[PDB]
Design an enzyme around this catalytic site. Structure first.
Site, PDB file in Angstrom:
ATOM      1  N   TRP A  80       0.394  -1.235   0.279  1.00  0.00           N
ATOM      2  CA  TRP A  80      -0.224   0.183   0.024  1.00  0.00           C
ATOM      3  C   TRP A  80       1.027   1.493  -0.103  1.00  0.00           C
ATOM      4  O   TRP A  80       0.393   2.513  -0.076  1.00  0.00           O
ATOM      5  CB  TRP A  80      -1.182  -0.134   1.197  1.00  0.00           C
ATOM      6  CG  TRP A  80      -1.853  -1.725   1.151  1.00  0.00           C
ATOM      7  CD1 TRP A  80      -1.570  -2.400   2.055  1.00  0.00           C
ATOM      8  CD2 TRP A  80      -2.958  -1.557   0.552  1.00  0.00           C
ATOM      9  NE1 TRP A  80      -3.166  -3.698   1.279  1.00  0.00           N
ATOM     10  CE2 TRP A  80      -3.409  -2.759   0.402  1.00  0.00           C
ATOM     11  CE3 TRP A  80      -3.568  -0.462  -1.346  1.00  0.00           C
ATOM     12  CZ2 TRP A  80      -4.505  -3.084   0.199  1.00  0.00           C
ATOM     13  CZ3 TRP A  80      -4.470  -1.740  -1.898  1.00  0.00           C
ATOM     14  CH2 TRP A  80      -5.162  -2.686  -1.015  1.00  0.00           C
ATOM     15  N   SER A 196     -12.991   2.966  -0.500  1.00  0.00           N
ATOM     16  CA  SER A 196     -12.430   3.762   1.795  1.00  0.00           C
ATOM     17  C   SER A 196     -12.305   5.277   1.034  1.00  0.00           C
ATOM     18  O   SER A 196     -13.498   5.811   0.269  1.00  0.00           O
ATOM     19  CB  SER A 196     -10.546   3.109   1.904  1.00  0.00           C
ATOM     20  OG  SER A 196     -11.444   3.316   3.341  1.00  0.00           O
ATOM     21  N   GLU A 323     -14.036  -6.149   6.992  1.00  0.00           N
ATOM     22  CA  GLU A 323     -14.516  -4.651   6.493  1.00  0.00           C
ATOM     23  C   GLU A 323     -13.129  -4.158   7.722  1.00  0.00           C
ATOM     24  O   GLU A 323     -11.802  -3.661   7.983  1.00  0.00           O
ATOM     25  CB  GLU A 323     -14.687  -3.173   6.828  1.00  0.00           C
ATOM     26  CG  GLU A 323     -15.799  -3.658   5.285  1.00  0.00           C
ATOM     27  CD  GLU A 323     -14.915  -3.526   4.334  1.00  0.00           C
ATOM     28  OE1 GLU A 323     -13.861  -2.588   4.531  1.00  0.00           O
ATOM     29  OE2 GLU A 323     -15.880  -3.052   2.867  1.00  0.00           O
ATOM     30  N   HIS A 436     -10.406  -5.428   4.820  1.00  0.00           N
ATOM     31  CA  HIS A 436     -10.947  -4.121   3.738  1.00  0.00           C
ATOM     32  C   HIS A 436      -9.303  -4.043   2.935  1.00  0.00           C
ATOM     33  O   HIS A 436      -8.122  -4.522   2.929  1.00  0.00           O
ATOM     34  CB  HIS A 436     -10.235  -3.576   4.962  1.00  0.00           C
ATOM     35  CG  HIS A 436     -10.601  -1.767   4.354  1.00  0.00           C
ATOM     36  ND1 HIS A 436     -11.691  -1.032   3.814  1.00  0.00           N
ATOM     37  CD2 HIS A 436      -9.446  -0.798   4.173  1.00  0.00           C
ATOM     38  CE1 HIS A 436     -11.585   0.104   3.495  1.00  0.00           C
ATOM     39  NE2 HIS A 436     -10.025   0.258   4.214  1.00  0.00           N
TER      40      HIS A 436
HETATM   41  P1  LIG Z   1      -9.806   4.167   3.420  1.00  0.00           P
HETATM   42  O1  LIG Z   1      -9.416   5.335   2.915  1.00  0.00           O
HETATM   43  N1  LIG Z   1     -10.468   5.216   5.529  1.00  0.00           N
HETATM   44  C1  LIG Z   1      -9.787   3.963   6.555  1.00  0.00           C
HETATM   45  C2  LIG Z   1     -10.192   5.899   7.393  1.00  0.00           C
HETATM   46  C3  LIG Z   1      -8.855   5.725   8.245  1.00  0.00           C
HETATM   47  O2  LIG Z   1      -8.189   2.705   3.807  1.00  0.00           O
HETATM   48  C4  LIG Z   1      -7.768   2.641   5.052  1.00  0.00           C
HETATM   49  C5  LIG Z   1      -6.632   1.897   5.139  1.00  0.00           C
END
Ligand SMILES: *[P@@](=O)(NCCC)OCC
Ligand SMILES: *[C@@H]1O[C@H](CO[C@H]2O[C@@H](C)[C@@H](O)[C@@H](O)[C@@H]2O)[C@@H](O[C@@H]2O[C@H](CO)[C@@H](O)[C@H](O)[C@H]2NC(C)=O)[C@H](O)[C@H]1NC(C)=O
Ligand SMILES: *[C@@H]1O[C@H](CO[C@H]2O[C@@H](C)[C@@H](O)[C@@H](O)[C@@H]2O)[C@@H](O[C@@H]2O[C@H](CO)[C@@H](O)[C@H](O)[C@H]2NC(C)=O)[C@H](O)[C@H]1NC(C)=O
Ligand SMILES: *[C@@H]1O[C@H](CO[C@H]2O[C@@H](C)[C@@H](O)[C@@H](O)[C@@H]2O)[C@@H](O[C@@H]2O[C@H](CO)[C@@H](O)[C@H](O)[C@H]2NC(C)=O)[C@H](O)[C@H]1NC(C)=O
Ligand SMILES: *[C@@H]1O[C@H](CO[C@H]2O[C@@H](C)[C@@H](O)[C@@H](O)[C@@H]2O)[C@@H](O[C@@H]2O[C@H](CO)[C@@H](O)[C@H](O)[C@H]2NC(C)=O)[C@H](O)[C@H]1NC(C)=O
Ligand SMILES: *[C@@H]1O[C@H](CO[C@H]2O[C@@H](C)[C@@H](O)[C@@H](O)[C@@H]2O)[C@@H](O)[C@H](O)[C@H]1NC(C)=O
Ligand SMILES: *[C@@H]1O[C@H](CO[C@H]2O[C@@H](C)[C@@H](O)[C@@H](O)[C@@H]2O)[C@@H](O)[C@H](O)[C@H]1NC(C)=O
Ligand SMILES: *[C@@H]1O[C@H](CO)[C@@H](O)[C@H](O)[C@H]1NC(C)=O
Ligand SMILES: *[C@@H]1O[C@H](CO)[C@@H](O)[C@H](O)[C@H]1NC(C)=O
Ligand SMILES: *[C@@H]1O[C@H](CO)[C@@H](O)[C@H](O)[C@H]1NC(C)=O
Ligand SMILES: *[C@@H]1O[C@H](CO)[C@@H](O)[C@H](O)[C@H]1NC(C)=O
Ligand SMILES: *[C@H]1O[C@H](CO)[C@@H](O)[C@H](O)[C@H]1NC(C)=O
Ligand SMILES: *[C@H]1O[C@H](CO)[C@@H](O)[C@H](O)[C@H]1NC(C)=O
Ligand SMILES: *[P@@](=O)(NCCC)OCC
Ligand SMILES: [Cl-]
Ligand SMILES: [Cl-]
Ligand SMILES: [Cl-]
Ligand SMILES: [Cl-]
Ligand SMILES: [Cl-]
Ligand SMILES: [Cl-]
Ligand code: NA
Lengths: 527, 527
Positions: A80, A196, A323, A436
């Site tokens: 990531w 997200s 998630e 997630h």
């Molecule tokens: P998303 O963009 N939102 C999570 C809020 C911190 O993914 C984070 C791993």
């Protein structure tokens, strides 16, 4: 040799063999003036324009951001982290086109997530060449400013108005409106898609009048602006801007002075203090996000949602089955990617302290009360599963489901999915389940690449997802019409039907997380 | 000391401690004249009546039948074999009442299955004392004639009219009508319940006018009369009666002579030839079953079903998730309870020969065609699972679903369930899954007995099933109303909603086996 002329100049791309065919990639085309110096913290400005030929043959810089160093050497997390140099000069997009150049292709525009604090369009799991090869759509993605440099706000003040990165996204959609027909694209058929924070972003472009005519339809993966981490209140935003000022010795009295000061600090110093603009924080903190700036976002978005003020078009929304799991190994006592994390009741309670910082005691007991009365007290991983559910349902699932209901109530077709396949290649442990971020690779087509160690069943799931997404984008309906596939119903307030995505049979079900979202959605907001 | 007086005489029962409470069991009360000698093959006759006190303190004899010797010493199979002496003198029922004697209790009457060739009401998995303890209903069960001695037919001839065992069931329901109020029962609230052939039986009592006023409602577990094994055509029935005559040197010219002859053979000799009254046979053979006799059953039951001629009342119907698995280890090449039975394509084809004996070649290919095109050709147990599905869907699932649709179309509330819990104590191998027969123990309450090595989750599932069944019986609605349980919708032609029964969450789904029953139900009946 493939050159295409744009309003702003010429650009050369590069050819790519994909699945015995060819796609043309134009990587790193710039799309605004670099936001340096006097530009730092301000809305993006007009790309000025070049003679000569820009070579768009490599990915460009990612915007400045903090990196995740929790697991150095671990693929799970490091996949990531950005994979091109960080630099303030990061406002570039990529285009992927089928070869031969299509004639009037539908356009998919990806918005990456990253908590609004991180992410880059050049991640491998965001590579648009499978989509373009297999569905002969065009795929565009953009880097946009993240963290304070993209969402610092001192409201009303144009030196730092807030939402800068949301207007970088916006100016990229304008760039496709102006330029895509030259690459063979239909500007009248654009679908935004995102995961997200990128999904939250998509949802706010649905509310933003300045976006209303830069796209046709919207896809929302694990995210929507009514999630509790997605929008910052004007209160906290100034608190944070000034806490940042403090921390970089920039507190001033003239606010254009605080900014002028802040515009002198080196990047590393702003990044280095972002984490502390805030007293308690959590693994899901979003210290610098979207705000109601009176410009991109003209009122609290919950009001705009309720009262039906948003682009009227179809939406496809979904969430993954586990998630909440991924955030537990960033701070919840007892949790590890390197063992099975059977936590105790007292540990669960401590977990709620980490995830629900301030956070009345009755608030927290009531979550315990909701999530811990089971059937039955026997199973050791009872508490471990419950904490992942608190976090998934609160942060992602219940808010995506309520967005979709409120949105469907005004008239438009919506489709909801519930992704429940665990990647055979997932590097995180089993107990963490369907995590997630881990649909992205199915949506992008990575498992179609046979060379790559995914199961047969996974290629099949992917090929089918890709076709549903590309049918939505072109036709506003995500069916797979050829291979006797389960028909995907529209989601309505009343029956609330959704489709489950897994390698075995996919099913029509009703009212995902009914009892849990009754808790998050009606009661919790009160504590 | 507990004596109760009946139309036919007095009977003494016995006290039983169950879960710190007491239930009174009256085991083996007779209910017709024994069918011996001149009575063999004829409708059951009036119980004549005794002074003195009958002691109903033990289970009585089971009817004559062949036993399963495929796995001697194996609990899996032997738990189904009769567990009291076999004897023609086997027409007795049991009653279980709550203590203190209830005042106007609802009555559950169990009809055991056994293929119409076997079974006995004294099996441990049919013990009615948990129901009576926990729900303070009364539970009645009856032994009824099975095999040739209960279903031999030479139509029109009262010496052997057919359906004898179905009229033994009927005369037992009359006996409860006449006598149950003395034990505290409400004769106006009787629910019949049954599994496999006992469910088929329940379904035909719904069609039989002579039963129409001996009960209120009906439960159908893994069975209904439109299953392909449940009714014998008049053609085959005489063929079989005469093949039996042949085989016992009883062929005659006068038919009352064949019977008179047959009424002289010893029991063992009739039993010993039953298997061969038929050229090919299969693991699901029913050589001597129900027939259209013009008496219990006045027309082909499929016609009576279609044209709405049957008792109008509520029905609860269900099937288990792996119905077909149990029959594969009785004859399908490659299959074993003692290994994992990964069979090959050619073995699957051979399997269809065992299960679909005569059976055009195009018939059989079309089953292969339907069941063997997958997603994808990779998994080794592909063929093993497919053969269990052919057999479940054909023999049990599609016919139970079509009974329930046809039945619901005329007006009454129906409920359908889909049982998918595998017993932690199941003695058959894993690959065999949620087998036929293995809901019975949950329905009877066996897992409520803590002393007994079932999981917590299993006790909970059982306690809830028991309450849904007892609510259906008393109220015609199988809800569990207290413990926040998923609400069980009625099944309608249109949405076809069913409820899944498992230890985790129970769900509302739609159109069980939709694609498969379209095959069994519209196309197959044509081949
Ligand atoms: P998303 O963009 N939102 C999570 C809020 C911190 O993914 C984070 C791993
Ligand atoms: C709005 O911000 C204040 C500022 O507090 C901070 O100073 C910043 C530079 C930063 O370093 C930060 O971590 C530090 O706390 C917050 O006030 C703090 O609140 C907590 C508990 O409420 C106290 O223990 C601190 O001592 C207090 N600090 C000061 C210097 O006043 C304030 O909490 C915040 N608002 C919200 C709702 O988060
Ligand atoms: C699973 O691991 C957690 C994680 O913490 C540890 O990671 C382990 C593999 C461990 O060996 C060590 O290197 C690291 O601290 C274990 O919880 C930890 O247990 C201690 C008590 O020793 C606490 O005081 C630690 O702070 C705590 N860590 C966290 C995240 O709070 C956990 O016990 C372990 N459980 C197992 C094996 O089931
Ligand atoms: C109706 O019954 C006849 C009778 O055949 C049988 O004789 C019985 C006593 C019994 O032993 C039985 O197993 C034996 O077959 C059936 O006729 C038979 O059919 C098969 C194939 O059709 C032939 O190979 C046999 O030779 C033939 N036997 C005789 C003696 O004619 C007949 O098939 C049956 N009807 C149905 C549809 O099953
Ligand atoms: C699983 O077992 C079947 C069942 O047949 C056998 O049971 C076995 C455990 C075996 O050792 C033997 O005692 C008994 O015959 C095996 O299929 C058998 O394989 C043979 C070839 O040897 C055939 O000619 C047999 O007739 C056949 N049995 C049946 C039911 O048709 C099967 O091969 C075995 N497979 C495994 C281990 O995967
Ligand atoms: C390309 O097609 C144009 C419009 O197509 C779209 O209609 C929109 C309202 C939207 O529904 C899209 O998804 C449709 O595909 C048409 O007006 C242009 O003139 C076309 N130009 C070409 C063919 O080169
Ligand atoms: C016992 O109750 C009698 C009838 O009860 C039933 O009504 C039926 C039509 C059916 O719905 C049943 O399920 C109902 O419970 C009543 O007429 C008798 O008189 C009663 N005798 C008593 C109380 O001892
Ligand atoms: C752009 O790339 C082409 C392709 O080989 C090259 O010919 C040209 O000189 C390049 N210009 C640069 C790197 O400025
Ligand atoms: C249709 O299924 C076939 C195999 O029958 C395969 O070529 C392909 O994966 C399918 N098309 C789509 C969109 O799923
Ligand atoms: C019936 O059983 C009772 C109970 O002990 C006994 O007193 C009576 O004599 C019995 N009659 C029999 C076995 O015929
Ligand atoms: C209700 O649940 C409780 C535990 O809360 C338990 O005593 C019992 O199993 C339940 N009653 C029914 C009918 O399921
Ligand atoms: C504060 O002072 C500076 C003067 O250089 C200016 O930039 C800013 O707008 C001033 N605002 C006021 C009125 O305080
Ligand atoms: C056949 O013969 C006997 C005479 O004892 C009798 O039982 C049977 O009914 C007769 N039927 C006819 C007319 O063939
Ligand atoms: P059911 O009574 N019917 C199957 C038809 C042979 O159970 C048999 C094991
Ligand atoms: Cl449990
Ligand atoms: Cl499908
Ligand atoms: Cl749910
Ligand atoms: Cl596969
Ligand atoms: Cl439930
Ligand atoms: Cl199904
Ligand atoms: Na509450």
């Amino acid at each position: 040799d493939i050159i295409i002329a744009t309003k702003n100049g010429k650009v050369r791309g590069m050819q790519l063999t994909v699945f015995g065919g060819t796609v043309t990639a134009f990587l790193g085309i710039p799309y605004a003036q670099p936001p340096l110096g006097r530009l730092r913290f301000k809305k993006p400005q007009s790309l000025t324009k070049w003679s000569d030929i820009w070579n768009a043959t490599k990915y460009a810089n990612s915007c400045c951001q903090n990196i995740d160093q929790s697991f150095p050497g671990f693929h799970g997390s490091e996949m990531w982290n950005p994979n091109t140099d960080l630099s303030e000069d990061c406002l570039y997009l990529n285009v992927w086109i089928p070869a031969p150049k299509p004639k009037n292709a539908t356009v998919l525009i990806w918005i990456y997530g990253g908590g609004f604090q991180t992410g880059t369009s050049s991640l491998h799991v965001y590579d648009g060449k499978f989509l373009a090869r297999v569905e002969r759509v065009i795929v565009v993605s953009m880097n946009y400013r993240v963290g304070a440099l993209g969402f610092l706000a001192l409201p009303g003040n144009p030196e730092a108005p807030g939402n800068m990165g949301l207007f970088d996204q916006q100016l990229a959609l304008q760039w496709v409106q102006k330029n895509i027909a030259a690459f063979g694209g239909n500007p009248k058929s654009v679908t935004l898609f995102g995961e997200s924070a990128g999904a939250a972003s998509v949802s706010l472009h649905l509310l933003s009048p300045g976006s209303h005519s830069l796209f046709t339809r919207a896809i929302l993966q694990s995210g929507s602006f009514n999630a509790p981490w997605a929008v910052t209140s004007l209160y906290e935003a100034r608190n944070r801007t000034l806490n940042l000022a403090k921390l970089t010795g920039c507190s001033r009295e003239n606010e254009t002075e605080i900014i002028k000061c802040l515009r002198n600090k080196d990047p590393q110093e702003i990044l280095l203090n972002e984490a502390f603009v805030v007293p308690y924080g959590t693994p899901l903190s979003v210290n610098f996000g979207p705000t109601v700036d009176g410009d991109f976002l003209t009122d609290m978005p919950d009001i705009l949602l309720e009262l039906g003020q948003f682009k009227k078009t179809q939406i496809l929304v979904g969430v993954n089955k586990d998630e909440g799991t991924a955030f537990l190994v960033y701070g919840a006592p007892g949790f590890s990617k390197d063992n099975n994390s059977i936590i105790t009741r007292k540990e669960f309670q401590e977990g709620l302290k980490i995830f629900f910082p301030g956070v009345s005691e009755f608030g927290k007991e009531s979550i315990l009360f909701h999530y811990t009365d089971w059937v039955d007290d026997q199973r050791p991983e009872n508490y471990r599963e419950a904490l992942g559910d608190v976090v998934g349902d609160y942060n992602f699932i219940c808010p995506a489901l309520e967005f979709t209901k409120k949105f469907s109530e005004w008239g438009n077709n919506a489709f909801f999915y519930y992704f429940e396949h665990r990647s055979s290649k997932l590097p995180w442990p089993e107990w963490m389940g369907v995590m997630h971020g881990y649909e992205i690779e199915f949506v992008f087509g990575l498992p179609l690449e046979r060379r790559d160690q995914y199961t047969k069943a996974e290629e099949i799931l992917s090929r089918s997802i890709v076709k549903r997404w590309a049918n939505f984008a072109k036709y506003g309906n995500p069916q797979e019409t050829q291979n006797n596939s389960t028909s995907w119903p529209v989601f309505k307030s009343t029956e609330q039907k959704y489709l489950t995505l897994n390698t075995e049979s996919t099913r029509i079900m009703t009212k995902l997380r009914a009892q849990q979202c009754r808790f998050w959605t009606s009661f919790f907001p009160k504590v």
